[PDB]
Amino acid sequence: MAFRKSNVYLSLVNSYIIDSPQPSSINYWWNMGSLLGLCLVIQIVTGIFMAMHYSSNIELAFSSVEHIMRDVHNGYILRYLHANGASFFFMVMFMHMAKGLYYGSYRSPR
Amino acid sequence: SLYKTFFKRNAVFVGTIFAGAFVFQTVFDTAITSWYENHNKGKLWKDVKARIAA
Amino acid sequence: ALSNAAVMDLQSRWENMPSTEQQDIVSKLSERQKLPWAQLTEPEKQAVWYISYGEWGPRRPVLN
Amino acid sequence: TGLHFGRLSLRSLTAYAPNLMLWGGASMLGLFVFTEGWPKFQDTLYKKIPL
Amino acid sequence: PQSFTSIARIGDYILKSPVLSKLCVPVANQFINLAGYKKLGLKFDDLIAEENPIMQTALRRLPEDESYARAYRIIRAHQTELTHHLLPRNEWIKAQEDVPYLLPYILEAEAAAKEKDELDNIEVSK
Amino acid sequence: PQSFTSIARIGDYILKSPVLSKLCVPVANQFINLAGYKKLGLKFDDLIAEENPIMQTALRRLPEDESYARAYRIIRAHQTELTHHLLPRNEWIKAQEDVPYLLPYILEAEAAAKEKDELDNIEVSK
Amino acid sequence: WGGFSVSNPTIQRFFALHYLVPFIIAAMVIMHLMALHIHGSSNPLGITGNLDRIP
Amino acid sequence: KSTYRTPNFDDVLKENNDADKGRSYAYFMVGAMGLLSSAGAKSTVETFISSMTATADVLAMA
Amino acid sequence: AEVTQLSNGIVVATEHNPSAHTASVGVVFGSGAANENPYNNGVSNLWKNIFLSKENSAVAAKEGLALSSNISRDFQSYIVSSLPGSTDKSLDFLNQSFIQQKANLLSSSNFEATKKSVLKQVQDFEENDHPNRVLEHLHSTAFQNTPLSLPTRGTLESLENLVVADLESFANNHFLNSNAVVVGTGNIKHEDLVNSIESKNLSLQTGTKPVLKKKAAFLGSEVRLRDDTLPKAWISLAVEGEPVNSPNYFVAKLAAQIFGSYNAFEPASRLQGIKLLDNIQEYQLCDNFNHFSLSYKDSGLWGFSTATRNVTMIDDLIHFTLKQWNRLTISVTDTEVERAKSLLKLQLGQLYESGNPVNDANLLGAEVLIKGSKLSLGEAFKKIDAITVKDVKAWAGKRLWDQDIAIAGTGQIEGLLDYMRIRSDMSMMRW
């Protein structure tokens, strides 16, 4: 058989993103699950690269968010991609909990 | 043909995607900077630096 | 008489019909017109109007 | 009547040695895209006649 | 989760009464074509969800000639809704062709699982 | 990953030489009882690792009567090792029952896959 | 270093990196039990264990 | 209607295939999407990697 | 071994063999199933079965003459085989009951008793012969809306509209003296045949068969005749091949001889030299596959037809096959060509040089109609001995690297993935 099916790791990739049979009639509301997967990586990657400059004491909390926005190269990008991207997390997710509430995706067997 | 040179081998398809994104990187950056400064002539620092002529 | 499998759907079949056969059918139809009418069958009656007054060659529109 | 082999054939290696050199060029062209703006690599990257 | 024996107990009470049949059957007809499963080319008994084991049973007792057509009107609906279009007005399911063909295969599978649980809790009076 | 065709080439050169057979065959059987697989009741061809298709092949061509004994000396060794004991001295495999019973089935199924790779790689002259 | 010697940019990034990597190890151990489960554990004799298995 | 009479795709089909021209146009718009997903992906991994370099204040005290 | 041609207004071909003990004599027409509209389709199949009808074959059996016939895409055929001492008794039958009188075969009794006997054979073909009703549905969707897509047997919906008018109107348009080849194979000299047409007359018609308005043009498509109540899954997949009298004719036959044919149940067809068989035998993805290179007058086909009980791993059969077609473009070895040279010279050494003369008369008339003369076997062996590895690579990169495909399937082809996951298997993305 093919190597995408014969491997122990790639068959998890194969059975989920390559060969997974999706119904051929799903509209664009079925992309909000794939956006939340992308929007989670945006928060996590712009959390690690932002928490390398963040001190968490009560004296240096607000003074080291401004150290990100003024002193780090492209620091205004990271703080704004991640404070607004967190507010885009909850807007995609509110449209993801309302697709499933509309199209009956809560019912059995799900 | 054109297909037989560029799009046939994938080794030279992505060779001229990267060689077309290397030229696009330096050209589109210059052609945006040269527009964005020209849209704001009279307001940037090197216009104030020349207008301090004493 | 004239068979059904030669004048069945003479709308999509008049063009891309070979030209020797294309005027063979108008030769058989011109002998069925030397009869009292309303004895021609309807695939033979609506397919002589398409030959004389259809939309092909002449009477083709200026734009497709 | 025997070929050299180690589950890859020498006759099937010289059929890719054109396209293995074209893939080395398509990676060096991919290295130059991602590693410009590196000021150390711009000693041999604005030696080009424009840009 | 509404158990078609209970629908048809309510539903046959409406149609039997002369007053309520004059009243809310014309509301029911206007509700049907406003839903517009006919425009996708479906009957109603394609719409019923087939994941409970009662409805999973009644799709095996169906004859072959009706389970081949039902398995086609579903694929014409997954193809029509994919193009974001409707079916042409000749291909719409008319009023007379919308009959409950799968209703009697459900009411004999529902009453056969109601009797299985009325008999699994029987208390024999000595 | 040594390929028994190879060690039967080095082995049968040692056995045929009169100088080396006097010299390193007394070291060979001293290596065997120091290894101590007989004391668990195993012949040596029980130990050959059976997870490659040249040896999984030669475990199907084994006769039924020897593939039932081999399936007993393995469980008698799994049971003796988890009690952390040894088999008693009247159950050890002696020096004469330690026969290469899986060597001819391997050597004929290993030289019949060397031949398959000398036939996907023939350069026939014109 | 984030600078010219081991300084405040370094220890601050050696903590936020050190918090992270045990959530890469804990997702590489799941990639380590998956490669084990397809063939099972070995056993100290080096023979097959498919005969006498216990749960 | 038999299964050998394929239905009309004439309002979807091209009027002239020329299979080295319809394929040198599909791989153009695919290649243009890969050309801006390389300028757009250098300029994303440059944002995160240069952010770990020396900050503006620690450059000032050199 | 030599074949000659003449012309008198009608071409006379003869492949004389002075060893065999029969003598086939027949006419081979230049029309087939590619010379009829989809509304009279099957009139070529209905003309064969009133030639082989009961009354016409009872008179032919009285002199010791057996009638054969063949209806193909490009050519028809009507052969009357007999003993070597009856080279004129079969011409006198073929002139009597095929050419001169047609009011005996086309009577109202013999036509209705034959229209119900083809309709029987077509209905028992459409539901009981699966590895060949896919190959009709491969032609019916590779070349759709074009003369090379019509089935040779005729559709069942068009075959019950035919009356004796459409049988005679096809005769006057295509059974002509400019369209025919009077062919004769077996134990007949050439000079006996041409003197036995001049001592008779044997004239058919005037000429000028109707010329087609649309040529054959490949269109990459698919068709899925899925049927879950069938125990297998038959699949035919093909690209556009080389037509006959192409310079790459024998390269396209050698390209399908590389991947050859396979039958999983034979113990000797499992030890072949194809490199595809190593990936296909580990889980037994198929039961059989044959690679074909069909070649018609205007176009052709090239691909493979298969059958499979392992209906869950179809998408690994199609993937592992198509990743071996890509080896033709990039890395085909010389031994894979030197093997398929020697098998192709045996493949078409058994086709043109078998024992049967009524098969050689089908392949002589179908060649001098198109090419004008039959290419001999000793010279067509020098065209296979001069094919290099570079000529297969130059052919494969033109004809099947990243080209469109035509798929046709039936049975349980749920497991068959859709088009763009098969069409994208033609290019390897690492070459």
Ligand code: HEM
């Ligand atoms: C689901 C994932 C996450 C969500 C929804 C989220 C959300 C948020 C929000 C709403 C803020 C406040 C932004 C503001 O008001 O400025 C914030 C700040 C922050 N988050 Fe996250 N976060 C996520 C993941 C992470 C991760 C994985 C990290 C660290 C590795 C992280 C580290 C930080 C840091 C350091 C701040 C600093 C304060 C700032 O500059 O905004 N976050 N996050």
Ligand code: HEM
């Ligand atoms: C966080 C670190 C690790 C965890 C949680 C882990 C977990 C496990 C577990 C639970 C087993 C099954 C129990 C056993 O077979 O002993 C196992 C087996 C094994 N591990 Fe680890 N492991 C770790 C590190 C390693 C490392 C560093 C190596 C080698 C470089 C390794 C190699 C193996 C091997 C070869 C086996 C199979 C042994 C056998 O089944 O015979 N593991 N691991």
Ligand SMILES: COc1c(O)c(C)c(C/C=C(\C)CC/C=C(\C)CC/C=C(/C)CC/C=C(\C)CC/C=C(\C)CCC=C(C)C)c(O)c1OC
């Ligand atoms: C059902 O079919 C599917 C489907 O199967 C899947 C998978 C998805 C996609 C959904 C997902 C992929 C969601 C899953 C998300 C996660 C598992 C989140 C994991 C994300 C991470 C970023 C993991 C964390 C790892 C890191 C942060 C490593 C990066 C390293 C850093 C930042 C340190 C850098 C330091 C140096 C020195 C380089 C679908 O959208 C979908 O529907 C179409």
Ligand SMILES: CCCCCCCCCCCCCCC(=O)OCCCOP(=O)(O)OC[C@@H](O)COP(=O)(O)OCCCOC(C)=O
């Ligand atoms: C003695 C110690 C006691 C302590 C107890 C604490 C630990 C308890 C054990 C919890 C489970 C540990 C192992 C988890 C694991 O490895 O599974 C991850 C999925 C592996 O799936 P699979 O079984 O390999 O595939 C077999 C399949 O049938 C199931 O595969 P599927 O479920 O689809 O995979 C999901 C992966 C998703 O990945 C992606 C990319 O989405």
Ligand SMILES: CCCCCCCCCCCCCCC(=O)O[C@H](COC(=O)CCCCCCCCCCCC)COP(=O)(O)O
């Ligand atoms: C992980 C968190 C979820 C992220 C959601 C992203 C879901 C979509 C992923 C898109 C990957 C596209 C690869 C497809 C592919 O390779 O097909 C390849 C070729 O396709 C292409 O060439 C596409 C050009 C490259 C597109 C670059 C997109 C990068 C943008 C990244 C944005 C998301 C991080 C095979 O396609 P084929 O089988 O039809 O031949």
Ligand SMILES: CCCCCCCCCCCCCC(=O)O[C@H](COC(=O)CCCCCCCCCCC)COP(=O)(O)O
């Ligand atoms: C890793 C998650 C990142 C997701 C970012 C999505 C939100 C878009 C805002 C992007 C701002 C950061 C980029 C930037 O500042 O560059 C700016 C240019 O804008 C872009 O190129 C955005 C294109 C993004 C395409 C993403 C392709 C997929 C990449 C996958 C990761 C390898 C500035 O560029 P410069 O530093 O001047 O070279």
